[PDB]
Amino acid sequence: PIKQEISEYFKDWMELYKKNAIDEMTYKGYEQTLKYLKTYMPNVLISEITASSYQRALNKFAETHAKASTKGFHTRVRASIQCLIEEGRLQKDFTTRAVVKGLEH
Numbered sequence: 001p002i003k004q005e006i007s008e009y010f011k012d013w014m015e016l017y018k019k020n021a022i023d024e025m026t027y028k029g030y031e032q033t034l035k036y037l038k039t040y041m042p043n044v045l046i047s048e049i050t051a052s053s054y055q056r057a058l059n060k061f062a063e064t065h066a067k068a069s070t071k072g073f074h075t076r077v078r079a080s081i082q083c084l085i086e087e088g089r090l091q092k093d094f095t096t097r098a099v100v101k102g103l104e105h
Contacts, residue, residue, distance in 0.1 A: 002089040006044045006077075007037040013080045033076040036061070046090065055098040062102025071101045 004012075014030045022030075040057050041049075062070045077095060084090040 002046050002084060004046055006041050006046050006049060007034065009046055009084075010034050010037050010077065010080050013083065017083065029072060030076055033073050036073055037077065046084070049094050051092075051094045051096065051098055054094045055100060058098060058100070059102050062104060065104060067101065067103030067105060070104070074098075074101050 002009075010030075011034050014027075014034065018027060018030055040061055044053075044057075058070065058074060061073060065073075074095065078093075081090065081093055081095050085093050
């Protein structure tokens with residue numbers, strides 16, 4: 001079972017598998033994505049997120065960010081959900097088909 005806030009977990013995750021492992025300038029991205037997560041998805045529990053929820057959060061984000069930017073957010077969040085799946089703590093990867101990443105230009 002996986003009961004925790006999406007934002008909280010992301011930080012937990014990044015500091016475990018990304019922190020000192022990846023480039024410094026690159027880690028900045030995860031810190032940003034973390035920040036974003038805290039904003040667009042406040043007390044959102046990982047176990048409540050649905051393909052729709054996520055797509056919706058992603059849309060709201062796209063209406064104030066560029067495509068490239070919104071993409072980076074998604075991709076990074078997606079990666080954190082993977083280990084959650086692999087570990088067998090999360091049933092369905094809601095970020096799976098939500099591949100739709102609203103643009104801006």
